Every structure is written in structure tokens, then in C-alpha cells.
Design an enzyme around this catalytic site. Structure first.
Site, PDB file in Angstrom:
ATOM      1  N   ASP A 127     123.462  58.756 -64.404  1.00 15.31           N
ATOM      2  CA  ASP A 127     122.592  59.083 -63.119  1.00 15.31           C
ATOM      3  C   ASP A 127     122.985  60.407 -62.483  1.00 15.31           C
ATOM      4  OD1 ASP A 127     121.317  58.399 -60.817  1.00 15.31           O
ATOM      5  OD2 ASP A 127     122.940  57.150 -59.825  1.00 15.31           O
ATOM      6  N   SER A 169     107.579  71.116 -58.865  1.00 18.46           N
ATOM      7  CA  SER A 169     106.569  70.765 -59.524  1.00 18.46           C
ATOM      8  C   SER A 169     105.320  71.565 -59.271  1.00 18.46           C
ATOM      9  CB  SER A 169     106.154  69.294 -59.800  1.00 18.46           C
ATOM     10  OG  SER A 169     104.993  69.345 -60.814  1.00 18.46           O
TER      11      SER A 169
HETATM   12  N1  U1H Z   1     119.943  57.878 -58.506  1.00 15.84           N
HETATM   13  C1  U1H Z   1     120.739  57.882 -57.431  1.00 15.84           C
HETATM   14  C2  U1H Z   1     119.698  57.985 -56.120  1.00 15.84           C
HETATM   15  C3  U1H Z   1     119.449  56.782 -55.598  1.00 15.84           C
HETATM   16  C4  U1H Z   1     118.503  57.155 -54.321  1.00 15.84           C
HETATM   17  C5  U1H Z   1     118.240  58.392 -54.073  1.00 15.84           C
HETATM   18  C6  U1H Z   1     117.420  58.575 -52.503  1.00 15.84           C
HETATM   19  F1  U1H Z   1     116.804  57.543 -52.353  1.00 15.84           F
HETATM   20  F2  U1H Z   1     118.203  59.069 -51.490  1.00 15.84           F
HETATM   21  F3  U1H Z   1     116.633  59.679 -52.830  1.00 15.84           F
HETATM   22  C7  U1H Z   1     118.941  59.328 -54.624  1.00 15.84           C
HETATM   23  C8  U1H Z   1     119.463  59.188 -55.717  1.00 15.84           C
END
Ligand code: U1H
Length: 330
Positions: A35, A199
Site C-alpha cells: 500500500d 498530473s
Molecule cells: N491506501 C491507503 C489510503 C487510504 C485512504 C486515503 C485517503 F482517503 F485519506 F486519501 C489515503 C491512503
């Protein structure tokens, strides 16, 4: 040193990707969701409430001769979709694809929200954003990438996600056979802790490219593409019968329609997302309404280039002292 590991979609819609990771001595192999939008390495474990576990492989620190409790340390995380989990912290050896880090913080879940419990194929998350987002208290912990950086041949990792097919995460080197043309690099802001970039514009299908700055994050942990309402409206307006549905929570479209492609700008280069990548299938079994892969970011607060976008490219995460993101066609 380098590391290389295959990453596999968990289902037929590419809702997420899992990558095997070896934790502990002897190794316990867990399938983790890599992630780049978070900075915690957390796993289902022998300490997770037994009712909150449904088929996951669990890490058992008591069977690892290299695991050490990090006395007093805790963690608690909430994700942008309302998911959460929390527990205590071990350090242990962690290896990905041949690349080994000793003394990595492994956050052991005592509690997980229901949406992790229902996802039997994901044993945990491996965060690859910047370590300033890590939730360990009182002493913040480094990510796997930050810990490995010293020993990597090049301080980079690359994401090569497949469409309905396996792909590759590489650490420490750029595989020049995995893409075509050149890599275009673009600046990263680390000020919110994300791989955040701008972007340069977009096009719908074979329409004219609209130059306009879209600030957003490169997030392997998010399935869909979340863009500003004006952009998403211009895309779905080209799909006959598409509409935004409040009961479903986003744009849906007749499953019989063919979807245009979507182009996004990286500096002067163009990354084309084929229309098929945007089809996330029927909203319920047997339905003739299908769920769109491009949705509005208005309710989220930040634009997110999730797997729908990233799997159209070869993506380089350059964690040099001035970080950059690289995109190439493949
Ligand atoms: N993949 C992790 C994650 C989940 C949600 C967000 C948000 F919603 F905060 F932008 C950022 C990062």
C-alpha cells in the site's frame, strides 16, 4: 542488494493485489497488500480476537526466534474507507522476494474492522508511503522501504500491476525490459506523507487533451481512480445511460455499453487507460447495471490514482533524497 516478488489479484475484478512476505525465523509466509498510501506494516496474528479472524494466515511471534516485543509501543490506524485496526508492536526479520530487513517493526493486530475480517485473502498490509505517516506511539517506526534503502543497489521500487493477471514489485533496480519507450519522471511533494504529484491533464476517449493540473497521490492500496467532479462528469457523459446513483454510491452504467479509454498526462507524456480497465462489473449478481472504475473525489478530499490508473503503467517510486515518480507505458 535487490528484491523481486510477484503480486497477484485477489479476485476476478482486481479489487486488490497480494504479495507473499516472509516474517520471522523460521519464515512465516503471509500474503500482504502493498500500500503506497500508508506507512504501517500490520498483520493478523496470534493476538487478534479470535472472532475477527476468518481464514487469514496469522503471524505467531511466539514461534519466531527473532521476534522481540517493542515494550510499550502501540499503533492504531483508520483508512479513508472507514477501516481500522490496532494492537501492539514486535520487531522481527522481514523478507520480500529475497530482500531481507532485520529489526523491522511488525504491528500485530489485536482488533481489526469488519472489512478486513471479510477479506480472507489479505493477511495484512505493507505500507510504502513516507515514514512520517506511521502510527506507532510513542516512538514512530520506519517502513520496510526506509529500512531497506541503505542496502539497495538503487533507492527505488517499481510497481508493475497486471490487468486480470499477476504482476511484479521490484526493490532496488529498474527492469528495463518491463516497459516500452522512456520513463517520464515528475516531482513528488512529501509534505502530507504521500507519493503526491501533479498530473498535467486528461482526455476522454479520442477527445482533445485538456491541460489542467490535477494534484493527487499514487496509491497501490486503493482500487479505483478518484478524480475531481468536473473530470469524472466529462468522462461518464460519453457513456450512454451512465448516471450517478446515490443508493449505489457513485457512477453506474449499463453493462452492455462499451467504455471509452481515459488518458492522463505525466509531464509531456500520456498514459492511456483502456476502457475495459474501468468496468468493475455488475453492482449485484445478475444486475444489468455495472460499477464504474472512475469516481468522484469530492467526498474524499484528495485525488487518488489507484490501481485502475497504475496498472496501465510501469511505475517507479524513486526514494532518492529528492523523491520522484516515474511513469512509462507498457
Ligand atoms: N491506501 C491507503 C489510503 C487510504 C485512504 C486515503 C485517503 F482517503 F485519506 F486519501 C489515503 C491512503
Amino acid at each position: 542488494s535487490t528484491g523481486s516478488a510477484t503480486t497477484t489479484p485477489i479476485d476476478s475484478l482486481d479489487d486488490a493485489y497480494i504479495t507473499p512476505v516472509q516474517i520471522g525465523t523460521p519464515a512465516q509466509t503471509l500474503n500482504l497488500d502493498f500500500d503506497t498510501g500508508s506507512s504501517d506494516l500490520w498483520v493478523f496474528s496470534s493476538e487478534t480476537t479470535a472472532s475477527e479472524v476468518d481464514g487469514q494466515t496469522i503471524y505467531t511471534p511466539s514461534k519466531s526466534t527473532t521476534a522481540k516485543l517493542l515494550s510499550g509501543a502501540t499503533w492504531s490506524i483508520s483508512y479513508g474507507d472507514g477501516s481500522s485496526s490496532s494492537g501492539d508492536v514486535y520487531t522481527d526479520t522481514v523478507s520480500v522476494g529475497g530482500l531481507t530487513v532485520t529489526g523491522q517493526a511488525v504491528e500485530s493486530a489485536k482488533k481489526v474492522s469488519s472489512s478486513f475480517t471479510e477479506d480472507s485473502t489479505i493477511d495484512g498490509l505493507l505500507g510504502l508511503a513516507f515514514s512520517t505517516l506511521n502510527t506507532v506511539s510513542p516512538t514512530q517506526q520506519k517502513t520496510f522501504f526506509d529500512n531497506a534503502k541503505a542496502s539497495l543497489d538503487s533507492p527505488v521500487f517499481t510497481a508493475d500491476l497486471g490487468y486480470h493477471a499477476p504482476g511484479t514489485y521490484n526493490f532496488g533496480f529498474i527492469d528495463t525490459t518491463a516497459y516500452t519507450g522512456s520513463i517520464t519522471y515528475t516531482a513528488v511533494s512529501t509534505k502530507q506523507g504521500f507519493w503526491e504529484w501533479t498530473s498535467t491533464g486528461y482526455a476522454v476517449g479520442s477527445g482533445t487533451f485538456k491541460s489542467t493540473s490535477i494534484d493527487g497521490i499514487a496509491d497501490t492500496g486503493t482500487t479505483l481512480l478518484y478524480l475531481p467532479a468536473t473530470v469524472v462528469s466529462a468522462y461518464w457523459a460519453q457513456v450512454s445511460g451512465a448516471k450517478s446513483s446515490s443508493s449505489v454510491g457513485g457512477y453506474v452504467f449499463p453493462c452492455s455499453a462499451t467504455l471509452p479509454s481515459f488518458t492522463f498526462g505525466v509531464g509531456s507524456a500520456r498514459i492511456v487507460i483502456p476502457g475495459d480497465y474501468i468496468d468493475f462489473g455488475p453492482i449485484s449478481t445478475g444486475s444489468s447495471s455495472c460499477f464504474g472504475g472512475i469516481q468522484s473525489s469530492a467526498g474524499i478530499g484528495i485525488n487518488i490514482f489507484g490501481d485502475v490508473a497504475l496498472k496501465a503503467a510501469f511505475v517507479v517510486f524513486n526514494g532518492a533524497t529528492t523523491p520522484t515518480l516515474g511513469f512509462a507505458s507498457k
